[PDB]
């Protein structure tokens, strides 16, 4: 019919499963951050699906130069140096959505199963993030088994966000300092989970084709 001009490279996703051990939410520790492990819990709440910036592309305000493939951290990121020798622009950039790449993003809230809960104790809660095809695969009330990587989530606020003014434990939760970004502020951390695999534990012609 016609030539499609937009054909970008595929974003492959690797999903693991069948791990030898399944952990509980209460068994999560900081020694396993950045490790591949499986957890089990009951889904409590599910957020909506949002587009997440993955590979941003920017254009220079001054000379109209183009900067592409800007990897994004937990916060919004912009270039600092123009690729144009002549141009002096450092801190003046505009995002280009046409050339940018976005990914599906969902936040899932889970809590430990009732049977695993110590008697007379409040359930423990954790945040699970789903991306790509794993989105909308867990519904509230289900008992799911997630396989993924334990991560630590900073306070993006502190780090400095465009247009965002920055800012249990009785003031004893003091963050880390000394960073350039954090001129007089401190950085706190939060344990989260990035899941790459979800398993929920708990007309004639069309039908005939399905059967063996």
């Amino acid at each position: 019919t016609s030539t499609s001009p937009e054909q970008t490279e595929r974003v492959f996703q690797i999903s693991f499963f069948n791990l030898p051990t399944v952990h509980r939410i209460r068994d999560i520790r900081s020694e396993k951050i950045g490790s591949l492990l499986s957890i089990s819990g009951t889904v409590t709440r599910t957020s909506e699906v949002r587009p997440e910036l993955y590979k941003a592309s920017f254009t220079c305000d001054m000379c109209r130069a183009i900067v592409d493939n800007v990897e994004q951290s937990f916060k919004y990121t912009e270039p600092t140096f123009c690729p144009n020798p002549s141009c002096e622009n450092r801190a003046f950039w505009t995002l280009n959505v046409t050339r940018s790449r976005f990914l599906d993003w969902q936040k899932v809230r889970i809590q430990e199963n009732a049977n695993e809960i110590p008697t007379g104790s409040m359930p423990r809660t954790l945040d699970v993030i789903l991306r790509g095809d794993s989105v909308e695969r867990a519904k509230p009330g289900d008992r799911c088994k997630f396989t993924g990587v334990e991560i630590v989530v900073p306070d993006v606020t502190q780090l400095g966000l465009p247009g965002v003014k920055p800012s249990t434990t009785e003031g004893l939760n003091s963050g880390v300092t000394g960073l350039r970004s954090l001129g007089v502020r401190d950085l706190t951390y939060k344990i989260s989970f990035l899941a790459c695999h979800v398993i929920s534990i708990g007309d004639q012609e069309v039908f005939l084709n399905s059967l063996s």
């Binding site: 030539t3 001009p5 937009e6 949002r50 587009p51 910036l53 919004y76 046409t98 966000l161």
Partner: protein
């Protein structure tokens, strides 16, 4: 030859040579080619009839002083596939070009139309694909989408700056005006001349303003999975689109799926997540139109000039009223007395305001008190489908303030506010209350003021206001004990009180009696209807033709044509009484009162004389006649007298019928 003025061809236009669709469309030559092709499509497109659809649409647009030209997506897709693909993929620039080419087709018909409306907007009617707010993903970004939902929240109409002009704080030079995106703010960082890091005071000698409104679209209860939380989106309504959707309604939104940077979102989530919105292109009122989803166009009750001529031709026929009555609920075998009442209620009367001091209701209320299996709920469903604005409610499912209007505290402003109800939503429409007898007393009592004064009075939390409720009420009820006792008076068969009964213009009592011939005929008709509706029993044209053939068997008038006819008659026809037999009506009223003096009989008051006049007006309206004739008055008298006679007991029914034989 100037290269910027050269143009390509359609097959060459199909071949894309740019890095993206937007870049291909924005090129001068490609833009000129697209504009030329769109103009050709608008000017030369012909339907099955052979006349230019969009020429007539433009004529009507200019006649009504409107600024919105409706274009059917299917027509464009068949005529120009490549242009339809471009519109689907890059709605923005394609819509800009389409708007330009439309003010040159409007201006073709009305040369000086620019003095009325500066710009004309193009609205897409039937997008082939329909999405749910759950199904939206990142692949739909910057592309036309069609979603359905519930208008939970609404803002007030604000003037938004079309063009923004900036001036340097320091230098003082005033930058040229810039296009204001609907989605997010426009700012200037780098000055072309001054080259100053500092901000610009925003000032302008003359600014053009644009209507702006925002709504909170929510998944409809019907479509959301059972027991799961709904999803919502924010819809932005620009000029000419404001106030078209009212809170609590069900709508289908055609718009552009857009994303923008949100700092607080990022902050809260902890990930680089972009906020999403919908830029409304077209709105279709889906409320009470579930069974009308098989039609095309933004409004199924709207009409064209040819359809108006067809309506006139149909009306000129002598037996128009009989056909209209027969076309009411064709799948229901008989009940020609429940169909006549329903038709009269649907058409309604003419409200009157004598010298600005006396207000007279102009709507007809109907009550169906009958046996369990006499096809009352189906009649109510048909009335809901046919009426322009209809609301359906159940007995106990309706509260005293769910009907009428209710008071809440506003989440945003933390102040008491007013919300509408069933009645409000049914303004200039019909309110259907199934299981009327099962209603709570409190609930029932609510509608008393609304059913006669056509207004709702609220005095709560410092809110002193009066609303407009010009809605007709058709209700279905079951007699006390679950079955009518024809021996006892009407009053003893129902628990309703005198005022509520008097407020009902027409009473239709339905009895289920065992009779060989009646049972045989009803069973035969029901079996034939069931066989007719079996799912198994161009492609679109063939489907429409077979549907028309099936419909022709049981209805003399097409259903869609009937709905358009009813809407046209209600909107454009206001019959008046000038010649009429005063003595006949006076004697009928006196006789009705004398016969109703009996204890336990159906109440009779001046309301029923006014109802006789209203039914005469409605019968006159059914023919698109500007004046009530004697035949219509006689028919109304016959209807009312027959209802009154049927409401009586078995013992005295013969005497009553013999006495009133003169009028009927």
């Amino acid at each position: 030859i100037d290269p910027l003025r050269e143009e390509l061809t359609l097959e060459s236009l199909s071949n894309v040579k740019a890095n993206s669709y937007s870049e291909w469309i924005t090129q001068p030559n490609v833009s000129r080619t697209i504009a030329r092709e769109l103009k050709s499509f608008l000017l030369e497109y012909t339907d099955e009839t052979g006349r230019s659809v969009y020429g007539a649409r433009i004529r009507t647009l200019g006649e009504m002083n409107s600024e919105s030209l409706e274009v059917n997506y299917r027509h464009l897709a068949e005529s120009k596939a490549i242009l339809a693909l471009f519109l689907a993929k890059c709605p923005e620039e394609m819509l800009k070009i389409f708007d330009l080419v439309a003010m040159e087709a409007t201006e073709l018909h009305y040369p000086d139309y620019a003095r009325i409306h500066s710009e004309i907007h193009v609205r897409i009617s039937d997008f082939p694909t329909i999405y749910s707010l759950r199904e939206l993903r990142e692949s739909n970004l910057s592309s036309l989408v069609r979603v359905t939902g519930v208008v939970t929240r609404r803002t007030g109409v604000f003037p938004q700056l079309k063009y923004v002009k900036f001036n340097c704080l320091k230098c003082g030079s005033i930058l040229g005006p810039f296009f204001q995106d609907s989605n997010e703010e426009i700012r200037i960082s780098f000055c072309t001349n001054c080259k100053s890091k500092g901000p610009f005071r925003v000032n302008g000698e003359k600014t053009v303003y644009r209507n702006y409104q925002r709504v909170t679209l929510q998944e409809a209860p019907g479509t959301v999975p059972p027991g799961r939380l709904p999803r919502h989106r924010e819809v932005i309504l620009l000029a000419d689109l404001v106030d078209v959707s009212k809170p609590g309604e069900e709508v289908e939104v055609t718009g552009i799926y857009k994303n923008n940077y949100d700092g607080n979102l990022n902050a809260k989530n902890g990930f680089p997540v972009f906020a999403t919105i919908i830029e409304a292109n077209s709105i279709k009122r889906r409320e009470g139109n579930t069974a009308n989803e098989g039609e095309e166009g933004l409004d199924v009750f709207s009409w064209t000039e040819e359809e108006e001529r067809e309506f006139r031709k149909i009306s000129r026929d002598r037996g128009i009223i009989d056909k209209i009555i027969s076309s009411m609920a064709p799948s229901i075998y008989g009940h020609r007395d429940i169909k006549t009442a329903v038709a009269c209620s649907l058409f309604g009367g003419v409200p009157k305001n004598v010298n600005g001091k006396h207000s007279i209701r102009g709507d007809i209320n109907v009550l169906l008190l009958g046996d369990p299996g006499t096809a009352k709920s189906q009649i109510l469903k048909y009335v809901e489908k046919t009426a322009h604005r209809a609301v359906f409610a159940t007995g106990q499912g309706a509260s005293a303030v769910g009907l009428t209007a209710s008071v809440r505290k506003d989440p945003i402003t933390k102040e008491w506010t007013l919300e509408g109800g069933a009645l409000v939503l049914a303004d200039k429409g019909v309110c259907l209350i199934d299981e009327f007898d099962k209603m709570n007393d409190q609930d029932r009592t609510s509608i008393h003021e609304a059913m006669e004064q056509q207004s709702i009075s609220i005095s709560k939390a410092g809110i002193v206001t009066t609303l407009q409720a010009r809605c007709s009420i058709i209700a279905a009820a079951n007699p006390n004990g679950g079955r009518y006792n024809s021996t006892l008076p009407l009053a003893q068969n129902v628990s309703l009180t005198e005022p509520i009964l008097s407020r009902f213009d027409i009473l239709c009592v339905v009895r289920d009696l065992v009779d060989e011939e009646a049972d045989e005929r009803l069973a035969t008709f029901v079996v034939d209807s069931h066989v007719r509706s079996h799912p198994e029993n161009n492609a679109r044209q063939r489907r429409l033709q077979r549907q028309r053939k099936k419909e022709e068997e049981i209805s003399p008038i097409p259903q869609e044509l009937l709905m358009k006819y009813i809407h046209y008659a209600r909107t454009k026809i206001y019959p008046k009484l000038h010649q009429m037999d005063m003595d006949k009506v006076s004697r009928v009223y006196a006789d009705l009162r004398r016969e109703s003096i009996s204890t336990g009989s159906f109440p009779i008051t001046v309301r029923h004389l006014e109802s006789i006049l209203r039914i005469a007006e409605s019968f006159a309206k059914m023919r698109l006649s500007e004046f009530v004739s004697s035949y219509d008055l006689d028919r109304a008298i016959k209807v009312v007298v027959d209802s009154f006679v049927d409401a009586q007991k078995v013992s005295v029914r013969r005497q009553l019928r013999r006495s009133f034989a003169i009028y009927t």
